[PDB]
């Protein structure tokens, strides 16, 4: 199976860069600071132009001191260390990284289309061939990531960026862990959490299969399967398990979701011995060409409108000052 | 005039405190109330019940909390206000600090809120007014409380709020930088490290009011960092059942912009006290506690802890002393 063969060349390469992460692949003065695309609690994201190439990138400036104050040290190293070892069409690309006395830097491909969350909200919902298009992309990405013993743990619409070509690109690996065994952290959003997680059972990759089940549902309906304005009720409703499908759900879609949204870890699609094949063959994915999608030779249902931050917000623009003094030097040397 | 005198007696006490007015062998430690550890105690002689906060000298140190704890003690013992728990005694049994306070048998607001889910706006308004006044009091002494939240507000027998946990209160004419509090209640300034002031409590009030009315707090997640991101976003969605006047108030309280945050402007509290949500509030009436509580916890008699959860009881024995000289 070319499928099995390609994931090994992939494991291999992931593994090289994983043992030997790439550091300082650029520096601040190679870029022009155009615009602040977003802000956070220990960093922001800036639209930049690489001076020599003339290409635009989304650049992440993490204030090293803030990162330590908020205890995000390894979460930070971990995301960087992962993005930098990873390579697949539908994951945002880390082009360059590097650091100052003051900051940490992560230059990503700029994806202007914004995130599926807004779009889905904007337009209400997605046709099933529409939803299936995005769904196909996730299945592959998980197949890839899981191959590397990586749990994503953060599937949700606002984490799926939509490129000019209309394809999904996954962002934010803060909570992704390389885990052979089982793990216990509560971290992903309430609507996408699997029963196991909520019961502090100690979960594994099958969680992402649960979450995919939720994404598909929301993409097809315009709301998640376990919704409630009260946080605690979101949790109860998941553990309960009762899922109702809008009239307009193909019998195929219903069947998929029953197998994805499945408490019985022994019967959940993804965790069985037949693997992702159970999903990739399911009757709801008959009209989908898996290698064409991987190669992006499949026409996308939607496309979003040299910059500019059109589909973004406006923010108070701050100087990127750098101390003459090296800050928190010891704890980030692995970056 | 009042504040003037309150600012006086608070000063007198703040510079002539009381220490070691009791001893461990004067109470029969009945049960654990909360979790450090707090125990329901009953005094031998008096026979009255109190709540005894027992602080482990060595974890305090190992956790670098000496100023903070020397502090709550110092402040608790010097404040006087209808909705502030009274410190009745204090002393160190040579291995851990002991603060003895009035017992407030009604329980955390927390457990009642979770049990019920959410209070009505009139119920919520009743509590809010009390904190609004308690903060005015406290700010007037130039104090910042910095630990507002349901699990820190006890309901007394009449259904009036009693504030415990002064763990993080500091006297701050000016500005401070310490990052403490509890994630869901932190204002952007304190997360964001460009220093902050007492306006941080009014933001917290907005969080409490919202959580009371709604049942959950405005910025919610299962990890603090995620909560911080939501707070910095500063973006808030309100339940549809929220009244418009309620919606208004929270927008003014949960203002990132210190320049338009209610309570931190020209009229101080009066902007809050005079807002349309509070129209039906007799503030002098609440201060005197001549308002009938919409809710009263079930108290049976001396020593009932039914309003509190159960907890394992470890023993408290004797064997880091030099550091608490003035405790």
């Amino acid at each position: 199976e070319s499928v099995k063969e390609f994931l090994a060349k992939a494991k291999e390469d992931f593994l090289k860069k994983w043992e030997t992460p790439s550091q300082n692949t650029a520096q601040l003065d190679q870029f022009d600071r155009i615009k602040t695309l977003g802000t956070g609690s220990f960093g922001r994201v800036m639209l930049v132009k690489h001076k020599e190439s003339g290409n635009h990138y989304a650049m992440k400036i993490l204030d090293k001191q803030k990162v330590v104050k908020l205890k995000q040290i390894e979460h930070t190293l971990n995301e960087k260390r992962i993005l930098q070892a990873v390579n697949f069409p539908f994951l945002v690309k880390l082009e360059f990284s590097f650091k100052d006395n003051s900051n940490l830097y992560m230059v990503m491909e700029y994806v202007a289309g914004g995130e599926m969350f807004s779009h889905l909200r904007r337009i209400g919902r997605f046709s099933e061939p529409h939803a299936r298009f995005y769904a196909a992309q996730i299945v592959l990405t998980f197949e890839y990531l899981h191959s590397l013993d990586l749990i994503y743990r953060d599937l949700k619409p606002e984490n799926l960026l939509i490129d000019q070509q209309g394809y999904i690109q996954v962002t934010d690996f803060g909570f992704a862990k390389r885990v052979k065994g089982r793990t216990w952290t509560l971290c992903g959003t309430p609507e996408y959490l699997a029963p196991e997680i909520i019961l502090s059972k100690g979960y594994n990759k099958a969680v992402d299969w649960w979450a995919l089940g939720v994404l598909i549902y929301e993409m097809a309906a315009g709301y998640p399967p376990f919704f409630a304005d009260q946080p605690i009720q979101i949790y109860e409703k998941i553990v309960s398990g009762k899922v109702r499908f809008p009239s307009h759900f193909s019998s195929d879609l219903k069947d998929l979701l029953r197998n994805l949204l499945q408490v019985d870890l022994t019967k959940r699609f993804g965790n069985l011995k037949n693997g992702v094949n159970d999903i990739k063959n399911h009757k709801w994915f008959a009209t989908t060409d898996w290698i064409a999608i991987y190669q992006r030779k499949v026409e996308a249902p939607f496309i979003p409108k040299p910059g500019d931050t059109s589909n973004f917000d406006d923010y108070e623009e701050e100087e990127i000052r750098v101390s003459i003094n090296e800050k928190c030097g010891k704890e980030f040397t692995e970056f | 005039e009042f504040l003037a005198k309150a600012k006086e007696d608070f000063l007198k006490k703040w510079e002539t405190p009381s220490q070691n007015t009791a001893q461990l062998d004067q109470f029969d430690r009945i049960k654990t109330l909360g979790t450090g550890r707090v125990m329901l105690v009953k005094h031998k002689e008096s026979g009255n019940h109190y709540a005894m906060k027992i602080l482990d000298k060595q974890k305090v140190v190992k956790l670098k909390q000496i100023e903070h704890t020397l502090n709550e003690k110092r402040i608790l013992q010097a404040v006087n206000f209808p909705f502030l728990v009274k410190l009745e005694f204090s002393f160190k049994d040579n291995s851990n600090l002991y603060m003895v306070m009035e017992y407030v048998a009604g329980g955390e607001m927390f457990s009642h809120l979770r049990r019920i889910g959410r209070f009505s706006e009139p119920h919520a308004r009743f509590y809010a007014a009390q904190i609004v006044l308690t903060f005015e009091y406290l700010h007037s002494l130039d104090l910042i409380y910095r630990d507002l939240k349901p699990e820190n507000l006890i309901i007394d027998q009449q259904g009036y709020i009693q504030v415990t946990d002064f763990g993080f209160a500091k006297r701050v004419k000016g500005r401070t930088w310490t990052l403490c509090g509890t994630p869901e209640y932190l204002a952007p300034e304190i997360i964001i490290s460009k220093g902050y002031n007492k306006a941080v409590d009014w933001w917290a009030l907005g969080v409490l009011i919202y959580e009371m009315a709604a049942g959950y707090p405005p910025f919610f997640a299962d990890q603090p960092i995620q909560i911080y991101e939501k707070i910095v976003s500063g973006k808030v969605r309100f339940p549809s059942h929220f009244s418009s006047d309620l919606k208004d108030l929270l927008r003014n309280l949960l203002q990132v912009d210190l320049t338009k945050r209610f309570g931190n402007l020209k009229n101080g509290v009066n902007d809050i006290k005079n807002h349309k949500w509070f129209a039906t509030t007799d503030w002098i009436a609440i201060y005197q506690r001549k308002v009938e509580a919409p809710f009263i916890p079930k108290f049976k008699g001396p020593g009932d802890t039914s309003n509190f959860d159960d907890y394992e009881e470890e023993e408290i024995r004797v064997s880091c002393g030099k550091e608490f000289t003035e405790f």
Binding site: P190 | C180, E184
Partner: peptide, 15 residues
């Protein structure tokens, strides 16, 4: 049923 979500359990002060 005891859910460990910060929407159910007592939230501890930022240590």
């Amino acid at each position: 049923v005891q859910y460990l979500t910060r929407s159910a359990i007592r939230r501890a002060s930022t240590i």
